[PDB]
PDB file of C-alpha atoms in Angstrom:
ATOM      1  CA  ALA A   1      26.504 -38.604  -2.323  1.00 20.93           C
ATOM      2  CA  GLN A   2      27.241 -35.767   0.420  1.00 20.98           C
ATOM      3  CA  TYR A   3      24.178 -37.800   3.092  1.00 18.41           C
ATOM      4  CA  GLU A   4      25.689 -41.796   3.412  1.00 15.75           C
ATOM      5  CA  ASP A   5      24.295 -44.554   4.982  1.00 16.00           C
ATOM      6  CA  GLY A   6      27.242 -45.012   8.006  1.00 13.83           C
ATOM      7  CA  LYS A   7      28.313 -42.232   7.620  1.00 13.95           C
ATOM      8  CA  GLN A   8      26.260 -39.582   9.456  1.00 13.51           C
ATOM      9  CA  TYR A   9      23.604 -41.951   9.653  1.00 17.10           C
ATOM     10  CA  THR A  10      23.675 -46.025   9.768  1.00 17.51           C
ATOM     11  CA  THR A  11      20.034 -47.613   8.850  1.00 17.75           C
ATOM     12  CA  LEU A  12      18.696 -49.932  10.737  1.00 20.15           C
ATOM     13  CA  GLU A  13      18.519 -54.574   9.484  1.00 20.58           C
ATOM     14  CA  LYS A  14      16.096 -54.628  11.701  1.00 19.03           C
ATOM     15  CA  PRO A  15      13.367 -51.991  10.938  1.00 18.85           C
ATOM     16  CA  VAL A  16      10.989 -50.927  14.131  1.00 16.08           C
ATOM     17  CA  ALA A  17       7.155 -50.148  12.245  1.00 15.96           C
ATOM     18  CA  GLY A  18       4.992 -47.771  14.057  1.00 16.79           C
ATOM     19  CA  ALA A  19       8.125 -45.635  15.642  1.00 17.82           C
ATOM     20  CA  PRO A  20       8.008 -41.858  16.501  1.00 16.16           C
ATOM     21  CA  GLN A  21       8.521 -40.349  14.400  1.00 17.19           C
ATOM     22  CA  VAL A  22      11.683 -38.041  15.695  1.00 15.12           C
ATOM     23  CA  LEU A  23      13.008 -40.451  18.166  1.00 15.06           C
ATOM     24  CA  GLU A  24      15.375 -39.311  21.091  1.00 16.17           C
ATOM     25  CA  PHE A  25      17.961 -40.752  23.299  1.00 16.46           C
ATOM     26  CA  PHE A  26      19.181 -40.445  27.173  1.00 13.48           C
ATOM     27  CA  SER A  27      20.325 -40.567  30.471  1.00 14.72           C
ATOM     28  CA  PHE A  28      21.418 -37.908  33.036  1.00 18.11           C
ATOM     29  CA  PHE A  29      24.201 -39.580  33.369  1.00 18.35           C
ATOM     30  CA  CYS A  30      25.287 -39.635  29.976  1.00 18.60           C
ATOM     31  CA  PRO A  31      27.920 -37.060  29.526  1.00 19.51           C
ATOM     32  CA  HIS A  32      27.829 -36.109  26.251  1.00 17.90           C
ATOM     33  CA  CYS A  33      23.105 -36.760  26.746  1.00 17.83           C
ATOM     34  CA  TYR A  34      24.566 -33.044  29.115  1.00 11.95           C
ATOM     35  CA  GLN A  35      26.192 -31.455  26.380  1.00 12.08           C
ATOM     36  CA  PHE A  36      24.010 -32.349  23.752  1.00 11.86           C
ATOM     37  CA  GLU A  37      21.148 -30.972  26.725  1.00 12.11           C
ATOM     38  CA  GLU A  38      23.492 -27.719  27.708  1.00 14.22           C
ATOM     39  CA  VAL A  39      25.857 -26.424  25.917  1.00 15.69           C
ATOM     40  CA  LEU A  40      24.361 -27.632  21.712  1.00 18.21           C
ATOM     41  CA  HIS A  41      20.601 -27.123  22.191  1.00 16.74           C
ATOM     42  CA  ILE A  42      20.863 -30.253  20.047  1.00 17.12           C
ATOM     43  CA  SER A  43      16.801 -31.487  20.394  1.00 20.24           C
ATOM     44  CA  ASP A  44      15.780 -28.002  20.088  1.00 20.37           C
ATOM     45  CA  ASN A  45      17.822 -26.793  16.778  1.00 20.20           C
ATOM     46  CA  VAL A  46      16.577 -30.233  15.577  1.00 18.78           C
ATOM     47  CA  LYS A  47      12.699 -29.099  15.974  1.00 19.80           C
ATOM     48  CA  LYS A  48      13.520 -25.788  14.643  1.00 16.67           C
ATOM     49  CA  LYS A  49      14.916 -27.769  11.301  1.00 15.14           C
ATOM     50  CA  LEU A  50      11.939 -30.336  11.185  1.00 13.92           C
ATOM     51  CA  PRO A  51       9.204 -30.173   8.268  1.00 13.25           C
ATOM     52  CA  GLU A  52       5.128 -29.088   9.587  1.00 12.96           C
ATOM     53  CA  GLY A  53       3.023 -31.959  10.974  1.00 14.01           C
ATOM     54  CA  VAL A  54       6.106 -34.162  12.722  1.00 15.41           C
ATOM     55  CA  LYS A  55       6.282 -35.248  17.048  1.00 15.13           C
ATOM     56  CA  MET A  56       8.655 -35.304  18.092  1.00 12.93           C
ATOM     57  CA  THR A  57       9.963 -37.324  21.323  1.00 13.11           C
ATOM     58  CA  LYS A  58      12.252 -38.155  24.131  1.00 10.48           C
ATOM     59  CA  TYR A  59      13.432 -40.794  26.413  1.00 12.22           C
ATOM     60  CA  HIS A  60      14.989 -42.008  29.760  1.00  8.51           C
ATOM     61  CA  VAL A  61      17.314 -44.829  29.872  1.00  9.14           C
ATOM     62  CA  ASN A  62      17.796 -47.651  33.092  1.00  9.89           C
ATOM     63  CA  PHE A  63      21.296 -48.757  31.461  1.00 10.73           C
ATOM     64  CA  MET A  64      23.427 -46.029  33.403  1.00  9.34           C
ATOM     65  CA  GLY A  65      23.635 -45.291  36.769  1.00  5.71           C
ATOM     66  CA  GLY A  66      22.174 -48.592  38.552  1.00  5.62           C
ATOM     67  CA  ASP A  67      19.493 -48.612  40.498  1.00  2.60           C
ATOM     68  CA  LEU A  68      19.168 -44.493  40.264  1.00  2.00           C
ATOM     69  CA  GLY A  69      19.091 -44.433  36.136  1.00  3.53           C
ATOM     70  CA  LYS A  70      15.421 -46.240  36.695  1.00  5.34           C
ATOM     71  CA  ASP A  71      14.768 -44.243  39.321  1.00  5.48           C
ATOM     72  CA  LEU A  72      15.470 -41.295  37.285  1.00  2.99           C
ATOM     73  CA  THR A  73      13.465 -42.998  34.030  1.00  7.86           C
ATOM     74  CA  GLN A  74      10.800 -42.906  36.744  1.00  2.65           C
ATOM     75  CA  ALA A  75      11.241 -39.362  37.037  1.00  3.06           C
ATOM     76  CA  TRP A  76      11.199 -38.521  33.238  1.00  5.68           C
ATOM     77  CA  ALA A  77       8.387 -40.376  33.527  1.00  5.29           C
ATOM     78  CA  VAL A  78       6.700 -37.987  35.857  1.00  3.36           C
ATOM     79  CA  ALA A  79       7.872 -34.806  34.048  1.00  5.20           C
ATOM     80  CA  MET A  80       6.137 -35.880  30.846  1.00  3.31           C
ATOM     81  CA  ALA A  81       2.816 -36.743  32.384  1.00  2.00           C
ATOM     82  CA  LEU A  82       2.776 -33.623  33.991  1.00  2.00           C
ATOM     83  CA  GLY A  83       3.711 -32.284  30.808  1.00  2.00           C
ATOM     84  CA  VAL A  84       7.723 -30.144  33.474  1.00  2.00           C
ATOM     85  CA  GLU A  85      10.159 -31.174  31.609  1.00  2.00           C
ATOM     86  CA  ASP A  86      11.089 -28.245  30.595  1.00  4.55           C
ATOM     87  CA  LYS A  87      11.612 -27.111  34.115  1.00  5.07           C
ATOM     88  CA  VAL A  88      13.490 -29.845  35.144  1.00  2.00           C
ATOM     89  CA  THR A  89      15.548 -31.040  32.856  1.00  2.00           C
ATOM     90  CA  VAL A  90      18.288 -28.832  33.174  1.00  2.00           C
ATOM     91  CA  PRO A  91      18.241 -28.770  37.226  1.00  2.00           C
ATOM     92  CA  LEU A  92      18.155 -32.638  37.311  1.00  2.00           C
ATOM     93  CA  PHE A  93      21.418 -32.756  35.020  1.00  2.00           C
ATOM     94  CA  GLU A  94      23.027 -29.846  37.216  1.00  2.00           C
ATOM     95  CA  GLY A  95      22.221 -32.720  40.008  1.00  2.00           C
ATOM     96  CA  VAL A  96      23.794 -35.917  38.622  1.00  2.00           C
ATOM     97  CA  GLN A  97      26.528 -34.535  36.896  1.00  2.00           C
ATOM     98  CA  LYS A  98      28.003 -31.316  37.573  1.00  2.00           C
ATOM     99  CA  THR A  99      26.583 -30.560  41.744  1.00  2.00           C
ATOM    100  CA  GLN A 100      25.619 -34.507  42.614  1.00  2.00           C
ATOM    101  CA  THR A 101      23.350 -33.377  45.183  1.00  2.00           C
ATOM    102  CA  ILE A 102      21.149 -36.242  43.582  1.00  2.00           C
ATOM    103  CA  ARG A 103      21.730 -39.624  44.980  1.00  2.00           C
ATOM    104  CA  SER A 104      18.682 -40.592  45.967  1.00  2.00           C
ATOM    105  CA  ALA A 105      14.414 -40.372  44.224  1.00  2.00           C
ATOM    106  CA  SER A 106      14.326 -38.261  48.042  1.00  2.00           C
ATOM    107  CA  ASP A 107      16.577 -36.348  46.130  1.00  2.00           C
ATOM    108  CA  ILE A 108      15.058 -36.426  41.812  1.00  2.00           C
ATOM    109  CA  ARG A 109      11.685 -35.620  44.351  1.00  2.00           C
ATOM    110  CA  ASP A 110      13.355 -31.874  45.234  1.00  2.00           C
ATOM    111  CA  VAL A 111      14.666 -30.965  42.050  1.00  2.00           C
ATOM    112  CA  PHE A 112      10.727 -31.120  41.672  1.00  2.00           C
ATOM    113  CA  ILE A 113       9.102 -29.353  44.292  1.00  2.00           C
ATOM    114  CA  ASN A 114      11.844 -26.460  44.223  1.00  2.00           C
ATOM    115  CA  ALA A 115      11.128 -25.974  40.512  1.00  2.00           C
ATOM    116  CA  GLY A 116       6.843 -25.524  41.394  1.00  2.00           C
ATOM    117  CA  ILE A 117       5.425 -28.998  41.486  1.00  2.00           C
ATOM    118  CA  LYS A 118       3.135 -29.852  44.181  1.00  2.00           C
ATOM    119  CA  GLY A 119       4.677 -32.829  46.466  1.00  2.00           C
ATOM    120  CA  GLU A 120       1.338 -34.835  46.510  1.00  2.00           C
ATOM    121  CA  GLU A 121       0.663 -33.712  42.368  1.00  2.00           C
ATOM    122  CA  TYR A 122       3.979 -35.153  42.390  1.00  2.00           C
ATOM    123  CA  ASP A 123       3.589 -38.240  44.627  1.00  2.00           C
ATOM    124  CA  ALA A 124       0.782 -39.444  43.085  1.00  2.00           C
ATOM    125  CA  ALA A 125       2.381 -38.987  39.687  1.00  2.00           C
ATOM    126  CA  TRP A 126       5.506 -40.929  40.918  1.00  2.00           C
ATOM    127  CA  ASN A 127       2.940 -43.729  42.002  1.00  2.00           C
ATOM    128  CA  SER A 128       0.070 -43.220  38.561  1.00  2.00           C
ATOM    129  CA  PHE A 129      -0.139 -46.784  36.369  1.00  2.00           C
ATOM    130  CA  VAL A 130       0.026 -44.312  33.640  1.00  2.00           C
ATOM    131  CA  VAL A 131       4.028 -43.303  34.923  1.00  2.00           C
ATOM    132  CA  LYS A 132       3.691 -46.809  35.147  1.00  2.00           C
ATOM    133  CA  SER A 133       2.891 -47.772  31.368  1.00  2.00           C
ATOM    134  CA  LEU A 134       4.914 -44.228  30.500  1.00  2.00           C
ATOM    135  CA  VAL A 135       8.166 -46.050  31.969  1.00  2.00           C
ATOM    136  CA  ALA A 136       6.635 -49.610  29.766  1.00  2.00           C
ATOM    137  CA  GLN A 137       6.737 -46.818  26.934  1.00  2.00           C
ATOM    138  CA  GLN A 138      10.412 -45.670  27.489  1.00  2.00           C
ATOM    139  CA  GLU A 139      11.982 -48.871  27.646  1.00  2.00           C
ATOM    140  CA  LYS A 140       9.874 -50.492  24.457  1.00  2.00           C
ATOM    141  CA  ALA A 141      11.283 -48.810  22.279  1.00  2.00           C
ATOM    142  CA  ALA A 142      14.868 -48.321  24.041  1.00  2.00           C
ATOM    143  CA  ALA A 143      13.996 -52.531  23.391  1.00  2.00           C
ATOM    144  CA  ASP A 144      12.882 -52.148  19.689  1.00  2.00           C
ATOM    145  CA  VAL A 145      16.285 -50.289  18.478  1.00  2.00           C
ATOM    146  CA  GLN A 146      18.461 -53.393  21.277  1.00  2.00           C
ATOM    147  CA  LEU A 147      19.986 -49.467  22.434  1.00  2.00           C
ATOM    148  CA  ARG A 148      23.364 -49.918  23.648  1.00  2.00           C
ATOM    149  CA  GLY A 149      24.777 -46.553  24.147  1.00  2.00           C
ATOM    150  CA  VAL A 150      22.805 -42.512  23.804  1.00  2.00           C
ATOM    151  CA  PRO A 151      22.472 -40.176  23.583  1.00  2.00           C
ATOM    152  CA  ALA A 152      21.207 -41.626  20.343  1.00  2.00           C
ATOM    153  CA  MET A 153      18.535 -40.566  18.493  1.00  2.00           C
ATOM    154  CA  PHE A 154      16.614 -42.474  15.018  1.00  2.00           C
ATOM    155  CA  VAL A 155      14.439 -41.115  12.607  1.00  2.00           C
ATOM    156  CA  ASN A 156      11.261 -43.229  11.941  1.00  2.00           C
ATOM    157  CA  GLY A 157      11.878 -46.487  13.462  1.00  2.00           C
ATOM    158  CA  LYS A 158      15.187 -46.308   9.718  1.00  2.00           C
ATOM    159  CA  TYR A 159      16.906 -44.261   9.967  1.00  2.00           C
ATOM    160  CA  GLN A 160      19.793 -44.238  13.415  1.00  2.00           C
ATOM    161  CA  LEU A 161      21.635 -40.217  13.666  1.00  2.00           C
ATOM    162  CA  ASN A 162      25.650 -41.168  12.901  1.00  2.00           C
ATOM    163  CA  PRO A 163      27.465 -38.487  14.907  1.00  2.00           C
ATOM    164  CA  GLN A 164      31.137 -39.556  15.566  1.00  2.00           C
ATOM    165  CA  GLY A 165      31.106 -38.463  11.535  1.00  2.00           C
ATOM    166  CA  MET A 166      30.119 -35.207  11.791  1.00  2.00           C
ATOM    167  CA  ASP A 167      33.270 -32.357  12.287  1.00  2.00           C
ATOM    168  CA  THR A 168      33.695 -31.558  15.463  1.00  2.00           C
ATOM    169  CA  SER A 169      36.018 -28.695  15.459  1.00  2.00           C
ATOM    170  CA  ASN A 170      33.044 -26.168  15.608  1.00  2.00           C
ATOM    171  CA  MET A 171      30.217 -26.479  18.076  1.00  2.00           C
ATOM    172  CA  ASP A 172      27.734 -24.553  15.271  1.00  2.00           C
ATOM    173  CA  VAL A 173      28.196 -26.623  12.760  1.00  2.00           C
ATOM    174  CA  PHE A 174      28.215 -29.124  13.890  1.00  2.00           C
ATOM    175  CA  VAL A 175      24.844 -28.912  15.555  1.00  2.00           C
ATOM    176  CA  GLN A 176      23.123 -27.170  12.457  1.00  2.00           C
ATOM    177  CA  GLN A 177      25.437 -30.458   9.923  1.00  2.00           C
ATOM    178  CA  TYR A 178      23.310 -32.869  12.881  1.00  2.00           C
ATOM    179  CA  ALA A 179      19.607 -30.985  12.357  1.00  2.00           C
ATOM    180  CA  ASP A 180      20.077 -31.224   8.373  1.00  2.00           C
ATOM    181  CA  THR A 181      20.750 -34.287   8.663  1.00  2.00           C
ATOM    182  CA  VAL A 182      18.175 -34.606  10.794  1.00  2.00           C
ATOM    183  CA  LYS A 183      15.806 -33.412   8.395  1.00  2.00           C
ATOM    184  CA  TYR A 184      17.045 -35.059   5.441  1.00  2.00           C
ATOM    185  CA  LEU A 185      16.576 -38.285   6.596  1.00  2.00           C
ATOM    186  CA  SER A 186      12.909 -36.831   7.724  1.00  2.00           C
ATOM    187  CA  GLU A 187      11.782 -36.569   4.197  1.00  2.00           C
ATOM    188  CA  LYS A 188      13.844 -39.886   2.459  1.00  2.00           C
TER     189      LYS A 188
END
């Protein structure tokens, strides 16, 4: 076939019930994730090809960057609760990997303040139980698929994208293949 299990994707031997339709995992410490976000715009291009009625979910993971890694997962919970993902994603990536000016929770907080979220708004969210369960969800979702690597995308709890099996000579072609694959899996 054109799309084969084990080539553009893998099938989970242990499918996850009730999983989000399109589920993406990343880490601000993750170098390919930086690429996926800054250079390739993967999430965006996938969305551009997803059918009507499909919800797209993106979660942060703890297993990179120790203590800050965890801080970053709570901060991503804050971003999701406040709806400011699109205002912090890029400064968090560059703060962690480009300028390396993010070294503590306080530096994470500065990115939000600079992006225009108010201090008291950030801190109340940071400390809120709504954020606590949002952290719990991120961890649960990753736990459910026994996740050891990012970037990672899962479709309807049964399929996992396999980017190692797509050509990378061209970046545009890589993205389109990636996105078309999500859409094929989506229709499956």
